[PDB]
Design a protein around this ligand. Sequence first.
Ligand SMILES: Cc1cc2nc3c(=O)[nH]c(=O)nc-3n(C[C@H](O)[C@H](O)[C@H](O)COP(=O)(O)O)c2cc1C
Ligand SMILES: Cc1cc2nc3c(=O)[nH]c(=O)nc-3n(C[C@H](O)[C@H](O)[C@H](O)COP(=O)(O)O)c2cc1C
Ligand SMILES: O=Cc1ccc(O)cc1
Ligand SMILES: O=Cc1ccc(O)cc1
Lengths: 399, 399
Amino acid sequence: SFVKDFKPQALGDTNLFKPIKIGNNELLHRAVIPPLTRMRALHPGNIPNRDWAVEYYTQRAQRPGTMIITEGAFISPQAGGYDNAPGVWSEEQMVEWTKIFNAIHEKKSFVWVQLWVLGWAAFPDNLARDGLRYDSASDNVFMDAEQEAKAKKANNPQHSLTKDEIKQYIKEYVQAAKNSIAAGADGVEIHSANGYLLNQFLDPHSNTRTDEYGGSIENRARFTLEVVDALVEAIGHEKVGLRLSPYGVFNSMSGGAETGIVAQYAYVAGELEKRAKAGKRLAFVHLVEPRVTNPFLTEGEGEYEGGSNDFVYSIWKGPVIRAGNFALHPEVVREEVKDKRTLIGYGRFFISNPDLVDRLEKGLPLNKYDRDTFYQMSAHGYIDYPTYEEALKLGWDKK
Amino acid sequence: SFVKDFKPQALGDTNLFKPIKIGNNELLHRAVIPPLTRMRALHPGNIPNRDWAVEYYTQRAQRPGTMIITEGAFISPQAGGYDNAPGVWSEEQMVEWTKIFNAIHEKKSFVWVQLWVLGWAAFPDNLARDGLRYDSASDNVFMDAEQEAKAKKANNPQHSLTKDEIKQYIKEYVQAAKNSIAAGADGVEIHSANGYLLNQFLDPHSNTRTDEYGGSIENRARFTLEVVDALVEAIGHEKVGLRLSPYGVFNSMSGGAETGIVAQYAYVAGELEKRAKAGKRLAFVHLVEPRVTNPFLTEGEGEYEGGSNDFVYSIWKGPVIRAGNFALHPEVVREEVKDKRTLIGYGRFFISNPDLVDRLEKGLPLNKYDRDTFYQMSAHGYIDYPTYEEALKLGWDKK
Ligand SMILES: Cc1cc2nc3c(=O)[nH]c(=O)nc-3n(C[C@H](O)[C@H](O)[C@H](O)COP(=O)(O)O)c2cc1C
Ligand SMILES: Cc1cc2nc3c(=O)[nH]c(=O)nc-3n(C[C@H](O)[C@H](O)[C@H](O)COP(=O)(O)O)c2cc1C
Ligand SMILES: O=Cc1ccc(O)cc1
Ligand SMILES: O=Cc1ccc(O)cc1
């Protein structure tokens, strides 16, 4: 059915429908599909889904000039730890991603691959099976109860990475970014948000190292910045984006409770503008908003109101993508896109509405999403949400 | 005469006229007098002016419950370097400040002493005369042309402070804060803005040290934070304020051009809130706005619009005083004081208008200031600006 007491608002008279150039791509509107894990990849191999993935992305690439950031894709087997999320390291995976990138490009939309490394969010037991380490920034701070339950049954204890093994992850980031561009993606987003490995090094709670990778603002940022710099040497700055969630608490990050958190993220933004002066301005910075500090909480739950992401605009002067409970708030979006360099990511309602961009443009009602199929191994809840037309033919009231 | 095409606006219906508690003081309105050097102190001795200073401050303390921050006062002779600015280190100076604090308190207003240390802004030649060093954070970066002219004629070269001599300045800050409270002041503001010594250690341009006082965000903040902590042990956190000018460029500071500047100031704000959790919340944070990056430029000149001070509010959760070209902009003030913990400093128009607070409350015209007497050794341009009544009796049109 459609979302119930939601009064939609048409947004075609705002800057969300003005064109903008992001990297090499000339987007025709500013509503982007943020990275969304759907756990339909095939095991063994972490292979993109052979039956359903091309249709899923072809459906969401239907409005020309749309920017799509894929689900997170593991850069290597050691980066992974979930059986049904995709990778971008082997020839069998890239054969299937090529077909997804060609289908999106035949629709005249764009496709950026999100590069993912789990760290302590990985299941230690899957990893133990495959012969791999359970990695994080440190060894004396765990994610939570059941993650330490997991690890000890599995006898796969949380490991602090050596400098050596941080370098190897940089090596794999470059290869996986080379692979995504060689199979035809328009660019890559470095996932450094939502509590996964690079964010575990950025956060003072998860990073109690005392070497060059821990202990100060600058050292805590060091791994994310080396990854930026290596991918910018490998494939060019106009093909790299960075995602940050300053105020997130998902996967045990500190959020607004850490008093030093704005300075930690202001430093990363200033180093990026530094590079932008020196010629290497990243295609964009993608921010998760305090409106959503945990993506497993229903919209409106877990909103952090003691801080804001607006400090990034005083520092970084390129495009920023902002995401977090914006589909149900067109009155908030109308204000945020008066800024001429701001794009809005829509996550959960792009899951239920293949044709979201038309619905935004025209103020049409919004299909409810079914949380129960976010992570099912099914076409149901994945490729069968109707467009507005089909939804009327189905009687979602109006028939 | 009155300011010419200025249309005033009455502000008595805003939060500028609601009471607020700052430290121990219950202010009756939120228009504060920011620190303003007027160079009427007597040489030798840096003695507050024996003839005119009590009247100057008594005139500006006329509206009950006003917070007044004094002109900068040197904590010791090595901190100084201008002959006619006051000090707060000797018995002869404190005899005269006592009389200023008693006169302000008989008017039922409050008085906070700004503690000043010049660093590289000092005249090296006055210092050479008196046997004192020309100090700064570093020795290979100078303030400007004529300051190095000065120094070499004077044969008094710019010196990088040793740890030892940084400790001695902390010793003198505590004594001078003990002296101000013992003579009767309500509190002290630590001057760490506008390019003077503590700001030279905070700024990456002026601070090229590689020891524990330079080289990173945390080390660059170290001297300002040790001074906060020493004065909070000495006299209590509800008697200490801190002034910061993130975006200032006066006295050769970096301003918005340094990409790392917001992170440098976000770190200082986060450490202060850290302490606020641990029980020691400073009475206030005083910020100079990007609206004024050099106080020698006429209002509207040198406005920095690529950044904002609003990031401090996501981090520090106590009172903030904001200053910078707000007297000519009541439409801007009306918006800024919707925030329930914001006070507005008025510098240059509190020089020409002893009765500014009534004029703000009622929307009355504003006396022009005479820049030519900001630093003269005269009563003229100091104690003879009229109140609105006297100005009408004088015919400043209306007679
Ligand atoms: C099912 C689901 C999967 C997600 N997968 C990812 C992911 O792979 N990487 C990522 O950075 N964010 C991920 N997110 C976070 C979203 O990109 C987004 O920031 C969050 O949902 C807030 O936007 P929303 O309120 O519009 O949905 C996911 C969110 C959901 C609900
Ligand atoms: C004559 C004059 C003397 C000043 N003296 C000081 C001082 O002693 N310490 C300080 O922190 N700021 C000093 N300032 C800066 C002001 O406090 C204030 O931040 C600046 O004037 C901007 O406010 P305005 O636009 O209202 O005047 C001075 C400014 C002027 C014009
Ligand atoms: O729900 C899956 C998920 C994956 C990666 C994220 O970044 C956030 C959520
Ligand atoms: O004009 C004098 C002056 C003194 C101290 C400051 O902080 C700023 C200006």
